[PDB]
């Protein structure tokens, strides 16, 4: 029965155009396909419909730089004047005899944006947590682009591996990325070193914040 397939990733440059492809399996070459966008950490948003005709409608508030078309078993979404906001996932979708079908989604990267270095804020354990006989260091990392970082912790100058939990990067509403890292310690471990450090490596450069008991 009806299957929609999408390439897992696509890219194009800021201000340029990109075309995303959704391929219908054989046997349904006459079905309407809809495109839905999904930003990091948000629900999907409907963009537009495309019928096997090349015509298209559009959703509320969708800019004119989004359009759709078709050729054979392929259905297309074209985004012109690419912006940082367009870095997101794109799913195609259709309907056939009570059954709904989704493609696997295409992750679009918008190339040619400026590198943006992370802003790092590091908090020591609170007085309240220490009185509860626990200790958490909180390393908050924001506003970086592209969206990949590595986080390393130091106790004085030695690497720490135990007790580290770090999130995956997620896109902010300002189209830069955020991540966080937590180091769990006993109050004794915290008080027994001169300092602890959170080291964030982004695009070949490492920045550090340090706290001390």
């Amino acid at each position: 029965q009806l299957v929609l397939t999408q390439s897992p990733s696509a890219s194009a440059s800021l201000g340029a155009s990109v075309r995303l492809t959704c391929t219908l399996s054989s046997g349904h070459s006459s079905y309407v396909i809809a495109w839905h966008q999904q930003q990091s950490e948000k629900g999907p948003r409907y963009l537009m419909k495309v019928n096997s005709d090349g015509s298209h409608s559009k959703g509320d508030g969708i800019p004119d730089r989004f359009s759709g078309s078709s050729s054979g078993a392929e259905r297309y979404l074209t985004i012109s004047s690419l912006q940082s906001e367009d870095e997101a996932d794109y799913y195609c979708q259709t309907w056939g005899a009570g059954i709904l079908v989704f493609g696997g989604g295409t992750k679009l990267t918008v190339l040619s944006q400026p590198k943006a270095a992370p802003s790092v804020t590091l908090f020591p354990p609170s007085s309240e947590e220490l009185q509860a006989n626990k200790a958490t260091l909180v390393c908050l990392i924001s506003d970086f682009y592209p969206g990949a970082v590595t986080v390393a912790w130091k106790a004085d100058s030695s690497p720490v591996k135990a007790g580290v939990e770090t999130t995956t990067p997620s896109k902010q509403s300002n189209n830069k990325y955020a991540a966080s890292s937590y180091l769990s310690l006993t109050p004794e471990q915290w008080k027994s070193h001169r300092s602890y450090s959170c080291q964030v490596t982004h695009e070949g450069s490492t920045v550090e914040k340090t706290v001390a008991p």
């Binding site: 989604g105 609170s126 908050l140």
Partner: protein
Amino acid sequence: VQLLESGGGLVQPGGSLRLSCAASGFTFSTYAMSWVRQAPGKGLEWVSGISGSGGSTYYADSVKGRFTTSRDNSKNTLYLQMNSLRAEDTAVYYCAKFSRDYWGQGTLVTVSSASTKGPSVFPLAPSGTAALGCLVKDYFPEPVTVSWNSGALTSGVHTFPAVLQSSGLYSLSSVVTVPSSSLGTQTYICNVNHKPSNTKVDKKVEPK
């Protein structure tokens, strides 16, 4: 048009849960309605569809016999009754209207043998701007909401996505950047809500 889901929460494997979707802004009974779900880090997956007014219902093979969709065309509400839930049914569930198409905002269904746990909330600092925040530590399941000064403070707020720790518990932080000149005198309170555990914490964050 608005579609507003409710009813998500934590359920033991084998348990039951009912989702609701309140529709407004269109003649509900004219349109077929759908349920779609999204497991963490995966794609959109169709769950079920129901004709306008309810005479025909369709289901993905993965939920057949366990999920039952229904609708109330006077209350303009769509329902999904889940029984015999499985860990792999864990997902954000969306109601949607596909003909303009419309999506709801999603509700999280977690199927797990782990217990509910409310967070501990700790204040974070501050050291012409200063960063201060709240640590929302060791809770399960998602989600947690955070506001500042009961919603009066929104500028400079950044609530971070949660980390899932090896313990199986979540933690998240919310930070706000404020004028350093306000620290003595302006009160900053983070309002933390973890509805799955009925936890509501208002934490005043003081300078040190």
